[PDB]
């Protein structure tokens, strides 16, 4: 008989501990694995695939239309859309990125925001996208917007433009749930010159917008998502 002493914590059950256990089914042989395409190893692998952002959130019931950012022909100087960058809330929240970020407490890294244009091929347009780093207000006019991170996008044969929100930060991690100290800025978009439709054409054209994370990205300290809850256990 070897002398032992038990410490504080004996008998506790910590849902996060990782130890060995007896197998209830001694000697059982599991089914062989066969090959299946698509294996995922890290959630970091999947948040780099871009998905659509319901940017046009202004509706009243969920609709395919809140994915469409409208553009008006012949407007000059004006603003196309605006949003803050609380990736865990608001427009971002239902996107795959938003949806995964919510399983973690802290995030750090660059984001990739792209816009794909869908107007007739014989039209043309020049837009400016601007990222405003924390510390200033959402820009109120392009002059204000153009003094921060921006890209003049020229609509052409190449249909999409990929803007990166480079990680601009004092503190090396931000909270995924919106927090002030930790806030990330604003994203706005304005006409640089203006949309022009060809003859025989009319109305609004739309941009689709996507979001995905750069390879830069870090997420840490897992927790429970506000995105799902329940009141009684389900049954069959």
């Amino acid at each position: 008989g070897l002398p032992t002493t038990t410490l504080p914590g004996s008998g506790q059950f910590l849902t996060t501990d990782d130890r060995q256990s007896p197998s209830a089914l001694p000697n059982y042989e599991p089914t062989p694995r066969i090959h299946i395409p698509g294996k995922v190893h890290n959630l970091l692998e999947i948040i780099q695939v871009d998905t659509l952002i319901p940017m046009n959130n202004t509706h009243t019931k969920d609709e395919v239309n809140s994915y469409l950012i409208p553009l008006n022909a012949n407007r000059q100087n004006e603003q196309v859309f605006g949003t803050n960058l609380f990736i865990g809330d608001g427009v971002f929240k239902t996107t795959l990125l938003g949806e995964i970020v919510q399983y973690y407490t802290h995030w750090s890294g660059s984001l990739r925001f792209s816009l794909m244009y869908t107007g007739p091929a014989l039209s043309s347009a020049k837009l400016i996208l601007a990222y405003t780093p924390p510390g200033a207000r959402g820009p109120q006019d392009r002059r204000e917007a153009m003094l921060g991170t921006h890209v003049v996008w020229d609509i052409g044969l190449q249909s999409t433009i990929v803007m990166t929100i480079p990680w601009t930060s004092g503190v090396q991690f931000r909270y995924t749930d919106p927090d002030t100290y930790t806030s990330a800025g604003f994203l706005s978009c304005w006409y640089q010159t203006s949309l022009i439709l060809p003859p025989e054409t009319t109305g609004q054209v739309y941009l689709l917008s996507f979001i995905s994370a750069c390879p830069d990205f870090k997420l840490r300290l897992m927790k429970d998502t506000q995105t799902i809850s329940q009141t009684v256990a389900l049954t069959e």
């Binding site: 510390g135 200033a136 207000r137 820009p139 921060g148 601009t168």
Partner: peptide
């Protein structure tokens, strides 16, 4: 200085 932009109020 880093992260230039619009000018804090």
């Amino acid at each position: 200085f880093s992260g230039i932009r619009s000018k804090s109020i």
